[PDB]
A = this chain, B = another copy of it.
Amino acid sequence: MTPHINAKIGDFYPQCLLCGDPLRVSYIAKKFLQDAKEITNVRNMLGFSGKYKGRGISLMGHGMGIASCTIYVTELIKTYQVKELLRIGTCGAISPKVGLKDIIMATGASTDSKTNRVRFLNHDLSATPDFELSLRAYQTAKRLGIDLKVGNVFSSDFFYSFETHAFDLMAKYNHLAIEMEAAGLYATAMELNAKALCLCSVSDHLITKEALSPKERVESFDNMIILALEMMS
């Protein structure tokens, strides 16, 4: 039905969790969902629909980077009628305000990409999440006793930065971490009148300088997963 998703129209629930990693999506379906069905698998980018403790949710992989993320989110909204999108990914810490393990809620996503300038009159689009979703996250995290760190992230076109000298400046301006997709998710959701939010877990520390294995990036962040499932349930 679209070039990158081979689900039937109607296979997605209106609420969808997203990860860049399709194997994290697969792990979520197996560990937390019942009656789960793989609904799409083009380019190995898996998506699922199932029940979290009796309530329907969908999961979808979005690949790495703003261009990849934009592709999947565009199709989810425009073709698959998805209304609420919650990214739960990984990020690299740069700020003294946060530590490893920490879950960050991104109230803004700054970027070194040109995509928002192309979208938005070559001006500065402030890429932001839906407020209702951010409120629901905060309240749920409180209810569950999960100490959520709240601020900006910086969404980069680079995993391997050319601007490591600038991390302190970013931290000063309340950038808690760097990842590579939130500004894409936020701008696409704004374009298309949908509700989006990004949470991310600090697996890696860019200034100290720890890094999780590929396996730990799938398996270490059950608290963030539970937060997402609970807030969309």
- A residues sitting closer than 8 Å to B (CB atoms) are 1, 3-4, 6, 20-23, 42-46, 61, 63-68, 70-71, 74, 105, 107-128, 131-132, 134-135, 138, 150-152, 154, 156-160, 162-163, 166, 169-170, 172-174, 180, 183, 187, 190-191, 193, 203-204, 211-214, 217
Contact = CB atoms under 8 A, between A and B. Distances in A.
B67 A158 contact: yes
Contacts of A45: 44
Contact of A114 (B112, B154, B170): B112
Nearest to A67: B65
Given A3-B159, A65-B65, A126-B152, 16 more contacts: A4-B64, A21-B44, A22-B43, A44-B45, A64-B68, A64-B71, A65-B67, A67-B113, A71-B160, A108-B127, A109-B126, A114-B157, A122-B122, A124-B125, A132-B150, A174-B193
Contact of A112 (B124, B135, B174): B124
A43 to B, nearest CB: 5
A31 to B, nearest CB: 17
A108 B120 contact: no
